[PDB]
Amino acid sequence: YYPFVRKALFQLDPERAHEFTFQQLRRITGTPFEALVRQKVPAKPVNCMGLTFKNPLGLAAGLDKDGECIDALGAMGFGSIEIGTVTPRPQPGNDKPRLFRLVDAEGLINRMGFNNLGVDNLVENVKKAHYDGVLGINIGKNKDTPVEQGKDDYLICMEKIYAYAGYIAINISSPNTPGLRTLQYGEALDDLLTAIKNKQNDLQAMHHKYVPIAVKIAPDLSEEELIQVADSLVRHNIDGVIATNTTLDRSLVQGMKNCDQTGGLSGRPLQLKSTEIIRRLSLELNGRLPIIGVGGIDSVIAAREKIAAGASLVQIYSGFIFKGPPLIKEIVTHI
Amino acid sequence: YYPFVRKALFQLDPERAHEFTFQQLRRITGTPFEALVRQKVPAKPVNCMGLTFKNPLGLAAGLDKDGECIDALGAMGFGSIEIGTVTPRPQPGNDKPRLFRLVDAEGLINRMGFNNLGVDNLVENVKKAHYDGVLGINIGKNKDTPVEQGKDDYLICMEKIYAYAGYIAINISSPNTPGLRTLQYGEALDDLLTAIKNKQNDLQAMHHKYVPIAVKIAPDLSEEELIQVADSLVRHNIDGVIATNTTLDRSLVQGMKNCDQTGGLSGRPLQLKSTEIIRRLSLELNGRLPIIGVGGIDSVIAAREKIAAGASLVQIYSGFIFKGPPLIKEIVTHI
Ligand SMILES: Cc1cc2nc3c(=O)[nH]c(=O)nc-3n(C[C@H](O)[C@H](O)[C@H](O)COP(=O)(O)O)c2cc1C
Ligand SMILES: Cc1cc2nc3c(=O)[nH]c(=O)nc-3n(C[C@H](O)[C@H](O)[C@H](O)COP(=O)(O)O)c2cc1C
Ligand SMILES: Oc1ccc(Nc2cc(Cl)c(O)c(Cl)c2)cc1
Ligand SMILES: Oc1ccc(Nc2cc(Cl)c(O)c(Cl)c2)cc1
Ligand SMILES: O=C(O)c1cc(=O)[nH]c(=O)[nH]1
Ligand SMILES: O=C(O)c1cc(=O)[nH]c(=O)[nH]1
Structure with missing residues (x-):
């Protein structure tokens, strides 16, 4: 019963809390206790980006940054697991504390800084996984890499993960790495999308398989910024868009503890804004490429609203923390 | 702990369930036995419609249709309580079964037909109350009254309740009295508001008392319809608008039990639509009269989302059933 565990x-x-939870998941992955987190969820396969997902509910990136709990998290019913974000070289991320709960808002604020052990380590973790669903691999830029040379970091990771990823996620939406969000704008985005797609085409020739690429945008894009982002994604033939990441907004959490902490806001205070972006994004895209909707999904209806907005799949992070594995079964069963 | 009470x-x-819970609330309302349901909530006074509201959260109309349990429900923490809807003459409402619970959607479908005991009985009940919040009295048209002469039902009710109401709510948004929603459109609304505004002027000189009047609209109005409603309310100097009532939409509950049931939908499947209506209404109204936001509120952030759309007050109903009294404490405390 999750509420007691949550308390x-x-x-x-x-x-x-995450470090403690991941300790347990590691200690049961592969054990006859691994059934302790297994969940029977109805099958609901969906074809998206040429992939076939067990069901339309995936675990958003940032929970398993290094991919060390794929099997245990996959047993909980997720139709797909997205690991990362990972960078080429390991890096410690920002100083602690860098993660804060807004319990009354059922939201979180984070300035992690891409805390991860590097892409090579993730690949080794992935090689040991038995997950049968779709594996997303989320990559980003190292802090020290210059913004205009950020493409190199993605291309490096793409080469190491191509043979192992079900799909690849391009993180240019974190508020916690300096200048990463400028990669969403104008020439920087076109420059980046070009480099990525040409690397994708060269890796398809080398590995004889197409791995789809999806870009993860931020929910703080203006209407004009979003139209340009959508257009650029269509012109470069990107296979998907993950909308959205966390928000700089605080307008809904004013007066609550930790509301002035720097970073990105997630959970319920992001739900509405995220949904509106997907709807505007869907109208621009006009079905040319699918949308993975994420942001404050904490209920069957909240997930259905994202689908109505134009999303083909959905992801959860904060609602899995505040409402637990029961929310997985809720969404998969009734979405 | 509500989740066990709700099961x-x-x-x-x-x-x-309503009959059983109200039988209990009737034997404790107005008596020291209402310690059983009392909740300490902080003072959060809001000025709205020339009145002072204890706190921004109110109990929406439809739960205490006859005014039997004002003191008990007030003890639960509500800053305002809206009783009704009540008609001039008693009527049984539509045939049972007329109320359906979704649950996976945390929503409700109802076709009650204004089941009430009449305005005269309500005034007697209100006479016994001792509620230090704002009491709203919600009045509607008797079933058999011609839509053309619907105003007469409202004027009758107004005279009988003016002396006892904090504000009067004009329900012309129910989907379960045939043709009642046409009073929202065109000069039908123009006629109704002229009569109501004139009765209000009269009753204020008669009773030496200021009593604001608010119109409760439906969530299924078209853009053009909403612009005309907003314009009509400002022109006729109506003191406030309660947006919104239940909806005929079912796009979010497809595939769930009772989704095809006839009537109005409420709760989580109405939250988003209700917030959009409020946002566009507030834009039209441009602060010329206040909005009472209601529709699928089941959290502090959901309540704040309606505040952010333009509402000055909020009401809950379906959320009260699915989340219980804790929602009152949550919303009043953190809104
Ligand atoms: C602690 C934390 C770490 C996150 N790390 C990542 C990340 O590494 N890469 C990424 O693309 N998104 C990351 N996210 C964003 C989530 O994947 C998700 O898109 C966002 O939180 C909104 O979804 P939600 O409201 O369901 O949590 C992180 C979020 C949190 C709270
Ligand atoms: C069973 C039921 C009875 C209702 N009765 C009335 C009523 O008599 N008068 C009225 O104006 N609204 C009535 N309503 C509408 C609600 O007060 C409210 O406006 C609507 O359900 C949206 O609020 P909610 O989603 O938080 O429940 C009723 C709703 C339900 C579910
Ligand atoms: O199956 C799971 C694996 C890891 C987590 N991580 C977690 C993350 C945060 Cl931010 C928390 O507040 C808690 Cl209690 C747990 C939660 C569930
Ligand atoms: O204090 C209260 C008084 C009456 C109700 N009505 C009610 C209404 C519905 Cl639809 C239910 O499924 C239940 Cl359990 C109760 C709910 C709370
Ligand atoms: O700092 C991070 O790791 C991080 C946070 C966030 O909200 N989004 C992201 O892509 N990275
Ligand atoms: O029939 C009713 O009582 C009724 C239902 C509803 O959704 N709205 C309303 O005003 N009345």
Whole structure:
């Protein structure tokens, strides 16, 4: 019964709670105790980006940044698992504390800084996984890499993960790496999308398989910024768009503890804004490429609203923390 | 702890559950036995419609249709309580079964037909109350009254309740009295508002009392229809608008039990639509009169989302059933 577990884990700070939870998941992955987290969810396959997903609910990136719990998290019913974000070289990320709960808002604020162990380590973790669903691999730029040379970091990771990823996610939407969000704008985006698609085409020739690429945008794009982003994604033949990442907005959490903490806001305070972006994004795209909707999905209806907005799949992070594995079964069963 | 109270309660038919819970609330309302349901909530006064509201959260109309349990419900923490809808003459409403619970959608479908005991009985009940919040009295048209002479039902009700109401709510948005929603459109609304505004002027000189009037609209109005409603309300100097009532939409509940049932939908499947209506209404109204936001509110952020769309107050109903009294404490405390 999750609410009791939640009350217990919430006595820890959010990052220590995750570290404690991942300790348990590692200690049961492969064990006859691994069934302790297995969940029977109805099958609901969906074809998206040429891939066939178990069901339309995936685990958003940022929970398993290094991909060390794919099997246990996959047993919970997720139709897909997105690991990352990972960078070429490992890096520590921002200083702690860098993660904060807004319990009354059922939201989180984070300035992690791409804390990860590097792409090579992720590949080794992936090689040991048995997940039968779709594996997304989310890559980003190292902090020290210059913004205008950020493409290189994605291309490096793409080469190491192509043979192992079900699909690849391009993170240019974090608020916590300096200048990463400028890669969403004008020439920077076109320059980047070009480099990525040419690398994709060269890796298809080398590995004799097409791995789709989806770009993860931010929810703080203006209407004109979003139209340009959509257009650029169609012109470069990107296979998907993940909308959205966390928000700089605080207008809905004013007066609550940790509302002035720098970083990106997620959970319920992001739901509405995320949904509106997907709807505007869907209208621009006009079905030319699919949308993976994410942001504050904490219920069957909330997930259906994202589908109505124009999304083909959905992801969850904060609602899995605040409402637990039951929310997985809810969404898969009734979406 | 509500989730366990709800499991039991939900074993009963929606309307049987109301009868049983209200039988209990009737034997404790106005008596020291309402310590059983009392909740301490902080003071959060809001000025709206020339009145002072204890706190921004109110109980939407339709739960205490006859005004039997004002004190008990007030003890639960509501800053305002809207009783009704009540008609001039009693009427049984539509045939049972007329109330259906979704549950996976945390929504409700109802076709009650204004089941009430008449305005005269309500005034007697209100006479016994001792509620220090704002009491709203919601009045509607008797079933058999010609839509053309619907105004007469409203004027009759107004005279009988003016002396006892904090504000009067004009329900012309129910989908379950045939042709009542046409009073939202064109000069039908223009005629109704002229009569109501004139009765209000009279009743204020008669009773030496200021009583604002608010019109409760439907969520299924078209853009053009909403612009005309907004314009009509400003022109006729109506003091406020309650947006919104239940919806005929079912796009979000497809595939769920009772989704094809006839009537109005409420709860989570109405939250988004209700917020959009409020946003566009507020844009039209441009602060010339306040909005009471209602529709699928089941969280502090959902309540704040309606505040952000333009509402000055908020009401809950379906959320009260699915989340319980804790929602009152949550919303008043953090809104
Ligand atoms: C602690 C934390 C870490 C995250 N890390 C990543 C990440 O590494 N890469 C990424 O693309 N998104 C990351 N996200 C964003 C989520 O994947 C998700 O898109 C966002 O939080 C909105 O979804 P939600 O409201 O369901 O949480 C992170 C979010 C949180 C709270
Ligand atoms: C069973 C039921 C009875 C209702 N009765 C009335 C009513 O008598 N008068 C009225 O104006 N609204 C009535 N409503 C509408 C609600 O007060 C409210 O406006 C609507 O359900 C949206 O609020 P909610 O989604 O938070 O429940 C009723 C709703 C339900 C579910
Ligand atoms: O199956 C799971 C694996 C890891 C987590 N991580 C987690 C992450 C955060 Cl921010 C928390 O506050 C808690 Cl209690 C747990 C939660 C569930
Ligand atoms: O304090 C209260 C008084 C009456 C109700 N009505 C009610 C209404 C419905 Cl649809 C239910 O499924 C249940 Cl369990 C109760 C709910 C709470
Ligand atoms: O700092 C991170 O790791 C991070 C946070 C966030 O919200 N989004 C993202 O892509 N990265
Ligand atoms: O029939 C009713 O009581 C009824 C239902 C509804 O959704 N709205 C309303 O005003 N009345």
